[PDB]
Structures are given as structure tokens and as C-alpha cells.
Ligand binder design. Structure first.
Ligand SMILES: [Ca+2]
Ligand SMILES: [Ca+2]
Ligand SMILES: [Cl-]
Ligand SMILES: [Cl-]
Ligand SMILES: [Cl-]
Ligand SMILES: [Cl-]
Lengths: 230, 227
């Protein structure tokens, strides 16, 4: 009921691996209208990542099965219908997150760190809608994802250090957007490489707190470069 | 809606790791009242094992947290445990109702009789893990009686290397160790099952050797742990 009580409840749900309970708790905290602490922001993000992620993973298995059944018209129809059922769940999750971002999280974000984080998150959830969209609505959704990422990108470039894990994480996800959604491997590689190289160049300005996360994300950036290069 | 379609939906749901959907499909298949095939009963078993399993795992983390508290936090942990318990009991009672109404009555073979009686033992055991005081003694006896009848039929009708007989021995030994706190009985049961399987090891066929030997390894791992 109370804010602090809902946060302790979310942490308990996290430990129980009951992420729908966790998402419900952090949604309620967000809806109280106060700016989320760094802890609360991370709890919200973890909760919804796991809720949407379960559907994404399932949709990837059912869509793959649907495509890899040629002659079975009845079996393919079942897979198609189950895929659509899963899509509807996924869309409702994404729309709940995107509504929270638009109504509470983005307008209340009083620091560049926070604003970049939430705009990146907006980019991610429009990207998850884009993964699942049919041709008519897809171009619009893809553009919404790109615009969110692009605004996040410009703010992080202006306000944040190249080694900042949120700036690096944005570069990772935006490069993935270009590769997987926009089919633009050259743009994806150049964004990823530039982010990696800028972090390498400013290796002095990197504190002992965000020293691990930063270097882990840099490794992921370069892993994508080597993968996409072949 | 038709059995064959529901079975295919269950398999789809399994691939998707959507186990509530899978359990719902196999529940409705069972409720048509025809004896389940080997494939169908295994789908039902996997579905509900995962559905109850999620609650059991959650109940193991929230119960522990409640234990290690000194406060408002304890009452929150208690109430969340109780909520998880309610879900868990409703799952177990669904499975146990399917077992009483459909599965155990229609079981035409000793193999399937043992399979379902073991299952009955398992789901009362999961209720026993979560019971306190009055109800527990009664819950524990139902588990034990299900296992005991299964055990007698398996010894009579199945070879020591049969995976269902071995799996029963494993779960019944775990019942003795974890529910009845009878470690000597648990070890004796597990040791006998392992040794008897080792002694008749030419009585396997190329199909079931992998499952049998995996359970044998789990039996011995428990013996090593429990010593
Ligand atoms: Ca859940
Ligand atoms: Ca599920
Ligand atoms: Cl949940
Ligand atoms: Cl969950
Ligand atoms: Cl499900
Ligand atoms: Cl599931």
C-alpha cells in the first residue's frame, strides 16, 4: 500500500522470481508520481525486462516452429494462433511500460542520467513492439523506437562520460536496433565502434563503482563488431 | 478442443516454456475420461511438475527470508508465503483430483498404476512440505500410503532397472528423509534400489538405459549426501 512497503514487496517478489508481482509493485510505485530513486528505477527495469522477456523468448520459439512447418496446414494454423495470443500479451506489457514512461518517468526525470535511461527504455520497448509488428504499423513503431534512442543518444553525448555504463548500454542497444530492426549493419558497426573507441580514449575518467559494468558492456560492443564483421 | 489438437497445443506450450498453458491443455485432455497414453501422461506430469515447481521454489526463498528476519518485514514475508502457499495447494489439489477421478481408475497396466500412485505420493508430499500442525499428520499418511502401494506393485511387477521403479525408490527415499525425518529408512531404501539395479544390469534395453542410470546416479548422490 505505502511506497516503501511496495518497494520491499518488489524486492521480495524478485527473490521469489515472481516478476509479474514485481512489475505490479513497481508500476504502483511509479503511479504515485514521485521521481524514482536509482534503486526503484532498476527494480522497475528488471521486473519488466523479465515479464516482457518471457513473452519474447516464447514468441521466438513459436514463430520459428510456425515458419519451419511446410505441409501441415492445421499445425501451422495452431502455431499462428498461439503466436498471436503471445503477441497480444507482449503488446499489452510494452504498452503498459510505454504509458508509464510517457506519463511519469520521462517528464519527471530531473537528471541527464535518468532521462537517458528512460528514453533508452522507451527505445527498447518500441523495439520489442517492432519485432512483433506486421507491415502496416511497423514503419511507425520503428520510427518511434529510433526517435527515442536518438534523443537519448544526443543527451548522453552532451552530458555523460563515454565510459558511463548507461551511455555504453545505449550504444549497445541502439547498434542492435540498427542491425536487427533497420537492417543497417554498417550504421550498427560504426555506432558500436565509435562508442567502444571513445570509451578506450577516455579510460582515465572511470570510477571504481562503474568500472566493471563499463568494461563488460565494452566487451559486448566489440563482440557484436566481430560477429557482424564476418 | 479435440484430444489430438489439445496434445499438440500442450507440446507447443512446452516448447514455449508456457507451463500453465501446457497444464491446462493436459488437464482438459485428462477430463475427456479416456486412459492416457505414455506420451500424454508424461506431458501432464512435466506440465504440473513445472507449475507446482515454480511455487515450491518461490516458497523456499520466501520461507527462508521470513526465518532470517528480526518487524514489518517478517509479516510481509509471512503474508507473501501464505499467498504462494494458497496457489501451491490449489495446484496440488487439481492434480490429486485428476488422479482420483480419472487417472488411477482408468490405469489398465501395473506400470501406469505405479506411475500415478507415485504421482499421488509426490503431490501429497508437496502439500506436506507446506502443511503445519493438525492437517500435516493426515497429509503425510496419504503421501506414504500412495508411495507404499506403488512400492509394493513395482517390486512385484517391475524389474529393478525399470526407470519408474527406480524413480519411485528415489522419491520415496526423499519422502522418508525430508518429510518423516527417517534418514536410516531413506538410506536403506535408496541403497537397496541402487544395488538391486546394479545386480541386474543386463536386463536393460537400448531405450530406457539412460533414464535408469541417471536415477541410479541420483540415488547414490543422495546416499553420499545423507552419510
Ligand atoms: Ca510470475
Ligand atoms: Ca506461464
Ligand atoms: Cl508473479
Ligand atoms: Cl515470473
Ligand atoms: Cl503459461
Ligand atoms: Cl511457465
Amino acid at each position: 500500500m505505502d511506497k516503501n512497503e511496495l518497494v520491499q514487496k518488489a524486492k521480495l517478489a524478485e527473490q521469489a522470481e515472481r516478476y509479474d508481482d514485481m512489475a505490479a509493485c513497481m508500476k504502483s510505485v511509479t503511479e504515485q508520481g514521485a521521481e524514482l530513486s536509482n534503486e526503484e528505477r532498476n527494480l522497475l527495469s528488471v521486473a519488466y525486462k523479465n515479464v516482457v522477456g518471457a513473452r519474447r523468448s516464447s514468441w521466438r520459439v513459436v514463430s520459428s516452429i510456425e515458419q519451419k512447418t511446410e505441409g501441415a496446414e492445421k499445425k501451422q494454423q495452431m502455431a499462428r494462433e498461439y503466436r498471436e495470443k503471445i503477441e497480444t500479451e507482449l503488446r499489452d506489457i510494452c504498452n503498459d511500460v510505454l504509458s508509464l514512461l510517457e506519463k511519469f518517468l520521462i517528464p519527471n526525470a530531473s537528471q541527464a542520467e535518468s532521462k537517458v535511461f528512460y528514453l533508452k527504455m522507451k527505445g527498447d520497448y518500441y523495439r520489442y513492439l517492432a519485432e512483433v509488428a506486421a507491415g502496416d504499423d511497423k514503419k511507425g513503431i520503428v520510427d518511434q523506437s529510433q526517435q527515442a534512442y536518438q534523443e537519448a543518444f544526443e543527451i548522453s553525448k552532451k552530458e555523460m562520460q563515454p565510459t558511463h555504463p548507461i551511455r555504453l548500454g545505449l550504444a549497445l542497444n541502439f547498434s542492435v536496433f540498427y542491425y536487427e530492426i533497420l537492417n543497417s549493419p554498417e550504421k550498427a558497426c560504426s555506432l558500436a565502434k565509435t562508442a567502444f573507441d571513445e570509451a578506450i580514449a577516455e579510460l582515465d575518467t572511470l570510477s571504481e563503482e562503474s568500472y566493471k559494468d563499463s568494461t563488460l558492456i565494452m566487451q559486448l560492443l566489440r563482440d557484436n563488431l566481430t560477429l557482424w564483421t564476418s
